[PDB]
Amino acid sequence: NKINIGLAVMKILESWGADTIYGIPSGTLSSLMDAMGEEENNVKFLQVKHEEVGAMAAVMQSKFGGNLGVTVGSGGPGASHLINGLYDAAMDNIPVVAILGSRPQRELNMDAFQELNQNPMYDHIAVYNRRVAYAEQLPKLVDEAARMAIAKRGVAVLEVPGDFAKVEIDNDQWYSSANSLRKYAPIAPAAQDIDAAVELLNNSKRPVIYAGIGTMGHGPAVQELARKIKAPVITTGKNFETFEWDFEALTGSTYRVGWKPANETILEADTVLFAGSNFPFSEVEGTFRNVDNFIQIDIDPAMLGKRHHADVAILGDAALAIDEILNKVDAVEESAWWTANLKNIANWREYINMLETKEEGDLQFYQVYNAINNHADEDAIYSIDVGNSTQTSIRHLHMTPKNMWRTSPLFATMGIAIPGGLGAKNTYPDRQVWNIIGDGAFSMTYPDVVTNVRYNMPVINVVFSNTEYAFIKNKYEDTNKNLFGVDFTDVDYAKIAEAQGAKGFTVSRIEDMDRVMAEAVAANKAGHTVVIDCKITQDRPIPVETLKLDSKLYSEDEIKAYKERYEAANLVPFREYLEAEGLESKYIK
Amino acid sequence: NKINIGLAVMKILESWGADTIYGIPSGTLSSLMDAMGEEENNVKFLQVKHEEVGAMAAVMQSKFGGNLGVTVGSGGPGASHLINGLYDAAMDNIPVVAILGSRPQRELNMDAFQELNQNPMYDHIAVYNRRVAYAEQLPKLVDEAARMAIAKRGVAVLEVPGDFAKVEIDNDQWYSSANSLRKYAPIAPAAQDIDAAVELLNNSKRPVIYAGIGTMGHGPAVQELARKIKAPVITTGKNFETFEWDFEALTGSTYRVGWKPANETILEADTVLFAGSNFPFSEVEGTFRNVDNFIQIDIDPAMLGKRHHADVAILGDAALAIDEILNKVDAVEESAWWTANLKNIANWREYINMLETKEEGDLQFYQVYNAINNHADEDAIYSIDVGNSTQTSIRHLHMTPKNMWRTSPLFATMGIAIPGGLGAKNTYPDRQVWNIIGDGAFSMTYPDVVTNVRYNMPVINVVFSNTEYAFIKNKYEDTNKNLFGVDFTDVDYAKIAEAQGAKGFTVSRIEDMDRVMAEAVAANKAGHTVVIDCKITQDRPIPVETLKLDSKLYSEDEIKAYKERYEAANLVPFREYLEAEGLESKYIK
Amino acid sequence: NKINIGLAVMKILESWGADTIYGIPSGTLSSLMDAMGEEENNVKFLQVKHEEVGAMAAVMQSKFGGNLGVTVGSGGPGASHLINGLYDAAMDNIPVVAILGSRPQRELNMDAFQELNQNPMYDHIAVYNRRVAYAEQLPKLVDEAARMAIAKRGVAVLEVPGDFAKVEIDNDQWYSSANSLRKYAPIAPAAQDIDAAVELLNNSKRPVIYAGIGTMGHGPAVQELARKIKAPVITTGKNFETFEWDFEALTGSTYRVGWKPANETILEADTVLFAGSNFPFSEVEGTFRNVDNFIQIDIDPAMLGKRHHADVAILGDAALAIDEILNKVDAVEESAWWTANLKNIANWREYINMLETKEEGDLQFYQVYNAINNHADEDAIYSIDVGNSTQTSIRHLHMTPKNMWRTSPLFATMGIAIPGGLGAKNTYPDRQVWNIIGDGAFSMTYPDVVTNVRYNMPVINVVFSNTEYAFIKNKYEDTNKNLFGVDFTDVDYAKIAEAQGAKGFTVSRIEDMDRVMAEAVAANKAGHTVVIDCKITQDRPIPVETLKLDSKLYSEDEIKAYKERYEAANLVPFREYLEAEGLESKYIK
Numbered sequence A, B, C: 001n002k003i004n005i006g007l008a009v010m011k012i013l014e015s016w017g018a019d020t021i022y023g024i025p026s027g028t029l030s031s032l033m034d035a036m037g038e039e040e041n042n043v044k045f046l047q048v049k050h051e052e053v054g055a056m057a058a059v060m061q062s063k064f065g066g067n068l069g070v071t072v073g074s075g076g077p078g079a080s081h082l083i084n085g086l087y088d089a090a091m092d093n094i095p096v097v098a099i100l101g102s103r104p105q106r107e108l109n110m111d112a113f114q115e116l117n118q119n120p121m122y123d124h125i126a127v128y129n130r131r132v133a134y135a136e137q138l139p140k141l142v143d144e145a146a147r148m149a150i151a152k153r154g155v156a157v158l159e160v161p162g163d164f165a166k167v168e169i170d171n172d173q174w175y176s177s178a179n180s181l182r183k184y185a186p187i188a189p190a191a192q193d194i195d196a197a198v199e200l201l202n203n204s205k206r207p208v209i210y211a212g213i214g215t216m217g218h219g220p221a222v223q224e225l226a227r228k229i230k231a232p233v234i235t236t237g238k239n240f241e242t243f244e245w246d247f248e249a250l251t252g253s254t255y256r257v258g259w260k261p262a263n264e265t266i267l268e269a270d271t272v273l274f275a276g277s278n279f280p281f282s283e284v285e286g287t288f289r290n291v292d293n294f295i296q297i298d299i300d301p302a303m304l305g306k307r308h309h310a311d312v313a314i315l316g317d318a319a320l321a322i323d324e325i326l327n328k329v330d331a332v333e334e335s336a337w338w339t340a341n342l343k344n345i346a347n348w349r350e351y352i353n354m355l356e357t358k359e360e361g362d363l364q365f366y367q368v369y370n371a372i373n374n375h376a377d378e379d380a381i382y383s384i385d386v387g388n389s390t391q392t393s394i395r396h397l398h399m400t401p402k403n404m405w406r407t408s409p410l411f412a413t414m415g416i417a418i419p420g421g422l423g424a425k426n427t428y429p430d431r432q433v434w435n436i437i438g439d440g441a442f443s444m445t446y447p448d449v450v451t452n453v454r455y456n457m458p459v460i461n462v463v464f465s466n467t468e469y470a471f472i473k474n475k476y477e478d479t480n481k482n483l484f485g486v487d488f489t490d491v492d493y494a495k496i497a498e499a500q501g502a503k504g505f506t507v508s509r510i511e512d513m514d515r516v517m518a519e520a521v522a523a524n525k526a527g528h529t530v531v532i533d534c535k536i537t538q539d540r541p542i543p544v545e546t547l548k549l550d551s552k553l554y555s556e557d558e559i560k561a562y563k564e565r566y567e568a569a570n571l572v573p574f575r576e577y578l579e580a581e582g583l584e585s586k587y588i589k
């Protein structure tokens, strides 16, 4: 007639679909874990080597479309180790339950061993943050923690004295509210707002669609609208998978982790259809400084008019809004604007393709991605870390909506890749998973490669060894009138992988890349976790946030040096393509 | 006539003796670092692979008697990575300056990239926590940060917008208050309080001295007092180096990370001289439940009467107090109490020595320490990690005041060892440094082994590979009516070390341990960082917090099993030694 | 071509409808206020005597259906004084912008006069909490503060260095996003969920509708449903105005601030239609312990299944849900259940009416309310303070949807009444406003009576002088086996009102109450603020949370004493009415 509180907690977690708990065992968590596996319960424990990797995996699990993740941290140091993963979830508004273990109740406030008040730890970023006051309410609080993490789209934190889960209660003294879980269906936009948008788009001479992840699942519709009104497409760094990598009108993304086309288009555009985005560089980089009209679509009222004055605001689902717009807007037969953009994009793709298809020489980022493109499954999942890998992956990977690409986009914590792969593979065990990592970030997390090995969750780690914290050093050449402290010694990551039970590869030449990738993938299909140590050059990826190509903006000397350093001799400034179509730059005089 | 704000900051840090900054480069920290090395400034940057290791090294640097440490974390993820190191410093009351990099001022509050309010992050544990409001006051705030960290004995945190250090100011618009640094000299205790202590000690039939780190530097005096009044000595887990490892009257420490003698003595004692300690298990483990009188010595008023009712309270330096007491107290010629304790200690040392000196078989903790004892320098420094290593090191290392032993004693974060070695070697470059680590903790920090290699700071890493998070699993056998999730796969750490430019060794047999240690030390003296992968058994160290040896407390079956499992056939319960001297247990009936 | 930042802020506030700022002038707020009134701006300043009254008025302004309120607090003490008002808004989820003045930027971090970090002050309860980093972004942050307070339904806090508002900017460097303000229209519920509800209601033998403020604006529909299926109605303490005070099937509210009928009905009910409520006593008072089925309607997913296991969960507007249910459910011709409830309600109304209509004697709460009922406008607004006034007002006021009743229901801060009247009168200048206050709460706020006088915002303060903190003392008789410290001396509040420029009245006899109220109202219509000092008895209002009337639950002695003390000789326990209709209590045996 009674049940162990720990088993009740597992039953509740199971009811909310939270069937995986990431973490490291602890005395302050013994009771909870001791209950795992009872009465046919299916909540599994995935042991990591560093609690931050567990927290990040639990979060990335949801990012990749998986179930609500749960992460545990032992009282004190275990709990504090969850921070980078929780801050990432908070900034990305991703649901995740964090359980902080604690000393038994009798020890609280006694200044005992590893005994402290952990309530302040995550109060600032959490949507729910409580210290269980007595054993009997633990089930209710775990249930609410799940409900709140999901409803508030954020981090739900519970501090749990270690002695509570051992307590027993009547089976009728607990319940799950998972059965009452309800979510709102996509909301249609106000016709009045769609019409105002249509009018502006019809009258615009240089329209451009800036699509954020709010357009996820509606890329075809966005591409259709783009072609109907001849409006080029700009995407955000988080939304590339939404488009066919080779879409004729895709200009890429603006600023640093972007493409040349996008950065030029935005400064020449008249009307922007800001769809489902909260682009953070908007104000500080003056992204929309030359735009005449601004139309925004978003399901969140707090975002309407946030990044720029909105001439038209549309509250509602991006899909529905795009569909309504597509159907009501006037078709455009030809546009000098569209034609110039297509050619500018084509020019950029020539540049990118020639870099990717070199046949011999010292290995660069480009050829590694080329190889990934020639060997990856069409529905491959990419877990991207922070640094040059982010910048290059969205330029050189050839994705489509069949893929998934995720990173730590806003908080931007390094080391998100390996955890990303764990959450992905846990969700899709038969799906090919890639972790694209810089050596600096890999260095903050490679001990967890063994986790994939131990749990038979085969992933392919691609490590870019340039022996520098490049993303910073590269920028140091600009912002810094010096440099200093951005390089380190190279280590044999392939050998480290072997020591961990993984399969390691080392490659440093372009002419060996295709074979190495072939062998790495074959190994992954043999059930092995792989680490490809790519010893690349220190060539800095082309900095499209500072395009030194237009002779009316930079000196010939500057242009020559820029072309030379970035192998961009054939890149043509957008103004040339505009003028060829009889148009004039609206800001370059 | 002007100076770069960044150079001013370095000059101020240099004036406070803070000549080393630990961290990882960042765009949000570029300005500050760019200034390092100018105008003959000698503030060096030590690059780590994970910011938590940098934060911990900066803290351990002071713990080991070094200069004020400085740690940097890039805005957001870099800063949050400092947490485990800062919480350790906070709980241990260790001075440390933490600089959090941040987006440029113009980006603050704009919800820009990696832009957030970091003030809440460490407000709870810091003694100083401010966000620089404008460039010109950065020097003043760094100066105050140093002054406050030192005066308040804690964490001083500054959030610094990345664009401030580039600003220039008049040389007369900044100054360091380091020249005004003043500290109080040891304060003599009130004679009235010393006399009350003396009277109690003179009249006590079973005195015992419980010495905490407040007695650091006065071990000889404590040993002299112990012999004068025939009072055995109990130490805290943090204070072993204060005594000669083989002192005839040293009973060790109480509770889990302790010895058998100490745990028995405390339950049989009448009067306790609690000198310079804030022992955290006092109340929750009922350490002093059978004590009749309690005398406390401490320089901190907040501690007087905290762990137990104090019959006599002495405010002042432990050295001075011990000296005053020693001189005024009556000499004791013989004591049945003393005699029984000495024999109980001798019995324990027989047990410990026989474990350490085995000649053949599967390697255990014991023989690794035996080897360390036979090959280490007499002034060696030991950086101890958290787990079975802590428990075993204080039982098997043969230290004296010439040594230094430090860990993460209260917050108890794993992974403190490697950082400890960095701070130690940075402070004493020609001194032998040992990092004693469990494989679980090593797994949270081994990527930083390369840091010692890269910076030519040779250390000896001793890794205990039992393929479990033993300290927890061991206790799981008691507290848990099950277990689960406490084991992992073994990895070749020696091979990982080689891949990092370090020298690796692997040992699994007792008969090879002496030679392996010899070769490891010789390598360390050759300037190499070493990793000794000790493949040990899963034998649980004897649990002295639950001594099942007295037939009046446990069944014969229990005693037999306990002796069998812990190879303690020859250990004799303290009550036998007491009775042999004509005394009776005061609680065992 | 340029504009003062302060004027820009006022223009933005005006665009969001925030035309009133409550507070007290300050050096740290001088710049902002100095700009009020410029270029035809219409943002007015309402000066209070205590900043907490200003914060509460700004909040109550929205509670009463007014515009977004703004409250200001001078750096340090002025800002901290806002706390009770902000916590009330936070717990009630009411939008409000709070501006904290601060020392000029140059003084920040200098430990200057009244200079401190106010970011921690309200971080825990705010939905937006930032310190303006530079003058130029102040406009953008005020605009976002308004947008966020509204979108997040909570407290938006901005700390503003006093020197920023003086700075000038280009008119094109600021904009308001108020034009993009959009809100979701009522969402229809899932038909599947409505049908499950209907089925349960059709099959229920004892249905009951528990309506919270989510049903606001749909009382007629709720009353119609109640009559159609013969389900009595229970309301929450915040939702009385939604029903006609004399609705035949209104049982009142459960627990302490409730009626006898409601408290009995809930323990005898089978199926509950929990509509638009988040009743806080649910679990701790076991409100639904005897209920068989539970159906919940709410627009917030986080609330579904929170207060009790939900057999049916309906996500969507309460109006739409009630309408769908009303139309699909089966009509019920007669019900023994309904009949018994109506008679129990009628019995309660006989009791209440006889108390209210006494003709002579010492004045009690009852006759004051009787008088208010006979003289108040039909659309009067009632601002209720915390204490016996809350308990009694919902029992003795005769409200309808034409009225508005508001208090501090969850955080429950005393002193909310006067601020409530200010916000109400500011919103509806020609509407009759009543402040019902206990003397204890009046004592925390009467200096602000002058505010109504000074700003010609005539209100009627009704003060219940029982010279005790009754709501507590009353309960002290139960929970406390003593009492102590709950009484104080009586003061002449009428005389205090006169000293403040208000009109004071004093009444202590039932036979004078009608005339006094008549004269008080006539004075209010003469444009004067009135204070009616009601010297009442210390008679404790009947405690319906402990009904000692059923002989099968209490001894005859207890019942006699209960009837005697609360003049309830004629109250009949519900079980009698149930049995008379051939039904049996489901829990009283």
Ligand SMILES: Cc1cc2nc3c(=O)[nH]c(=O)nc-3n(C[C@H](O)[C@H](O)[C@H](O)COP(=O)(O)OP(=O)(O)OC[C@H]3O[C@@H](n4cnc5c(N)ncnc54)[C@H](O)[C@@H]3O)c2cc1C
Residues within 6 Å of the ligand: A211, A212, A213, A214, A215, A235, A236, A237, A238, A239, A253, A254, A255, A256, A257, A258, A275, A276, A277, A278, A279, A280, A297, A298, A299, A300, A303, A316, A317, A318, A319, A386, A387, A390, A407, A408, A409, A410, A412, B113
């Ligand atoms: C090292 C690094 C460098 C980077 N560099 C760049 C860079 O140069 N350029 C760049 O663009 N990014 C860059 N990023 C990523 C960048 O920081 C942002 O995270 C990203 O651009 C935000 O993209 P977003 O607008 O698509 O989505 P979010 O910021 O997640 O916003 C999505 C919006 O969509 C709305 N929404 C959600 N669902 C719907 C729906 N159904 N209908 C309508 N609206 C909906 C939401 O309410 C929200 O407002 C970088 C990241 C890293 C780690």
Ligand SMILES: Cc1cc2nc3c(=O)[nH]c(=O)nc-3n(C[C@H](O)[C@H](O)[C@H](O)COP(=O)(O)OP(=O)(O)OC[C@H]3O[C@@H](n4cnc5c(N)ncnc54)[C@H](O)[C@@H]3O)c2cc1C
Residues within 6 Å of the ligand: A113, B211, B212, B213, B214, B215, B235, B236, B237, B238, B239, B253, B254, B255, B256, B257, B258, B275, B276, B277, B278, B279, B280, B297, B298, B299, B300, B303, B316, B317, B318, B319, B386, B387, B390, B407, B408, B409, B410, B412
């Ligand atoms: C995994 C793990 C297990 C552990 N297990 C144990 C265990 O079983 N048993 C155990 O004992 N410890 C154990 N520890 C260590 C333990 O948690 C405490 O940190 C330690 O015992 C505190 O020792 P202390 O009293 O010497 O010093 P502190 O707690 O640092 O207190 C020192 C006191 O000395 C005072 N003081 C300082 N200078 C002076 C002066 N000049 N004169 C006078 N007073 C002065 C201070 O004000 C303070 O009150 C463990 C640690 C870990 C990480």
Ligand SMILES: Cc1cc2nc3c(=O)[nH]c(=O)nc-3n(C[C@H](O)[C@H](O)[C@H](O)COP(=O)(O)OP(=O)(O)OC[C@H]3O[C@@H](n4cnc5c(N)ncnc54)[C@H](O)[C@@H]3O)c2cc1C
Residues within 6 Å of the ligand: C211, C212, C213, C214, C215, C235, C236, C237, C238, C239, C253, C254, C255, C256, C257, C258, C275, C276, C277, C278, C279, C280, C297, C298, C299, C300, C303, C316, C317, C318, C319, C386, C387, C390, C407, C408, C409, C410, C412
């Ligand atoms: C001294 C004091 C004593 C008190 N004593 C009592 C007492 O004895 N009994 C009592 O009942 N109260 C009492 N109260 C008030 C009590 O504390 C609660 O604040 C009140 O009962 C909450 O009422 P509620 O459920 O209507 O609304 P709320 O708690 O405000 O919850 C309203 C719910 O409606 C939902 N909602 C909003 N709009 C819609 C919509 N359009 N459609 C559907 N759902 C919607 C919301 O999401 C929310 O879940 C007392 C207050 C004080 C100050």
Ligand SMILES: CC(=O)c1sc(CCOP(=O)(O)OP(=O)(O)O)c(C)[n+]1Cc1cnc(C)nc1N
Residues within 6 Å of the ligand: A386, A387, A388, A389, A412, A413, A414, A437, A438, A439, A440, A441, A442, A464, A466, A468, A469, A470, A471, A472, B024, B025, B026, B027, B074, B077, B078, B081, B114
């Ligand atoms: C964006 C940001 O803040 C970056 S990008 C970057 C370079 C990463 O180097 P890696 O070697 O992994 O990759 P590479 O650029 O390909 O060489 C650093 C150090 N940072 C700062 C930083 C520091 N520390 C942490 C934990 N997270 C971040 N994001």
Ligand SMILES: CC(=O)c1sc(CCOP(=O)(O)OP(=O)(O)O)c(C)[n+]1Cc1cnc(C)nc1N
Residues within 6 Å of the ligand: A024, A025, A026, A027, A074, A077, A078, A081, A114, B386, B387, B388, B389, B412, B413, B414, B437, B438, B439, B440, B441, B442, B464, B466, B468, B469, B470, B471, B472
């Ligand atoms: C004390 C405490 O909280 C311990 S002791 C311990 C076992 C350490 O295992 P390791 O393999 O390093 O050593 P071993 O015991 O010799 O096998 C754990 C997991 N914990 C919990 C824990 C978790 N995570 C972190 C960051 N710090 C701590 N202290």
Ligand SMILES: CC(=O)c1sc(CCOP(=O)(O)OP(=O)(O)O)c(C)[n+]1Cc1cnc(C)nc1N
Residues within 6 Å of the ligand: C386, C387, C388, C389, C412, C413, C414, C437, C438, C439, C440, C441, C442, C464, C466, C468, C469, C470, C471, C472
């Ligand atoms: C509910 C709650 O917490 C109450 S009800 C109550 C009695 C109020 O006395 P008053 O004289 O105003 O009214 P009366 O009951 O009619 O005599 C007190 C002191 N409290 C505690 C309390 C204390 N202080 C403040 C600021 N707010 C509250 N709510």
Ligand SMILES: [Mg+2]
Residues within 6 Å of the ligand: A438, A439, A440, A464, A465, A466, A467, A468, A469, A470
């Ligand atoms: Mg790199």
Ligand SMILES: [Mg+2]
Residues within 6 Å of the ligand: B438, B439, B440, B464, B465, B466, B467, B468, B469, B470
């Ligand atoms: Mg281990």
Ligand SMILES: [Mg+2]
Residues within 6 Å of the ligand: C438, C439, C440, C464, C465, C466, C467, C468, C469, C470
């Ligand atoms: Mg009163």
